[PDB]
Amino acid sequence: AEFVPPPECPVFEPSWEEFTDPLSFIGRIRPLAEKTGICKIRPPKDWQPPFACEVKSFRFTPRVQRLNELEAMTPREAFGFEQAVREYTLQSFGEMADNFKSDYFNMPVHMVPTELVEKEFWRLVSSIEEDVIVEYGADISSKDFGSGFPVKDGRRKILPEEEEYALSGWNLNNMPVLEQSVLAHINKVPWLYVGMCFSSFCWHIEDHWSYSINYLHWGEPKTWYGVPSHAAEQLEEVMRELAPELFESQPDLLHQLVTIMNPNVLMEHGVPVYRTNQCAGEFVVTFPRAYHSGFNQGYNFAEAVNFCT
Ligand SMILES: CCCO[C@@H](c1cc2nccc(C(=O)O)c2[nH]1)c1ccccc1Cl
Ligand SMILES: [Mn+2]
């Protein structure tokens, strides 16, 4: 009855030698990681970049997420006016996020097991008797208040011990993003995600089937689910079979806005699914055409960008 956690995706702990170049390292781990879709990379213990966002000015309006919006399809009065998008700071969002989680579980936020938040998230997604609503500071451009990584653009001070991280290849601002094409001869920045408990992103692949790299700067873990690219057509078949008929014929770019599905449903149809808990300071790499989704365990701050090889 309860949620069955998928098997864990690979976790790599590269030495300082292997950590020298990200593209070479990802190319070496590819024979295994491309068979799981996603993988986690723990940097060496002494690799600790600072947080370089403009915190004093960081203001955002997170989007409202109703967990059971799809199960509710199968009309309430004044639908569409459930909750307005409101402005937070990092501090005020974190206070709201911690208060929500501690009130919901009746525990301190860091004492709640990750398996319990996971089991409760999927129960709420399919629940018609309990309407839980959360907020997600998602798709915040790094050009607004700066990247979480230090950058040498002359906008914010960089200490001498921090210059290493502004020049590091693992700095998401230093990832290659320019795809090769003839049009490029004839003629992208990271995004930020401020999460709270139960805030989520649904199943999707990247534009142009691109790689993606994701870094959790700080906070509570981000829970991931990934499908290897060799099962991409299997997942899309399961989606079309079980998606509402109103959304079944929608283009993939639009359907990916509401592609929420319990991983056990995919596993029961033969789709291989892997999971991981991405903790603060760890990278998650998604491979080409690897479907992925997930949710946040609590107040956290992530940075993501598509990169090309
Ligand atoms: C309201 C959340 C927005 O969801 C993003 C999103 C993608 C993504 N990929 C990796 C990690 C996260 C993460 O929220 O941490 C992601 N969020 C998204 C979901 C489906 C389709 C397209 C887009 Cl743009
Ligand atoms: Mn993604």
UniProtKB/Swiss-Prot annotation:
Task: Tell me the lineage of the source organism.
Answer: Eukaryota, Metazoa, Chordata, Craniata, Vertebrata
Identify the residues that bind Fe cation.
H204, E206, H292
Protein name per UniProt = Lysine-specific demethylase 5A
Describe the task this protein carries out. Histone demethylase that specifically demethylates 'Lys-4' of histone H3, thereby playing a central role in histone code. Does not demethylate histone H3 'Lys-9', H3 'Lys-27', H3 'Lys-36', H3 'Lys-79' or H4 'Lys-20'. Demethylates trimethylated and dimethylated but not monomethylated H3 'Lys-4'. Regulates specific gene transcription through DNA-binding on 5'-CCGCCC-3' motif. May stimulate transcription mediated by nuclear receptors. Involved in transcriptional regulation of Hox proteins during cell differentiation. May participate in transcriptional repression of cytokines such as CXCL12.
Which compartments does it reside in? Nucleus, Nucleolus; Nucleus
The record names the disease as:
A chromosomal aberration involving KDM5A has been found in M5 type acute myeloid leukemia. Translocation t(11;12)(p15;p13) with NUP98. Chromosomal aberrations involving KDM5A have been found in M7 type childhood acute myeloid leukemia. Translocation t(11;12)(p15;p13) with NUP98.
Q: Which residues form the JmjC domain?
A: 164-309
Spell out the family assignment given in the record's similarity comment: Belongs to the JARID1 histone demethylase family.
Natural source organism = Homo sapiens
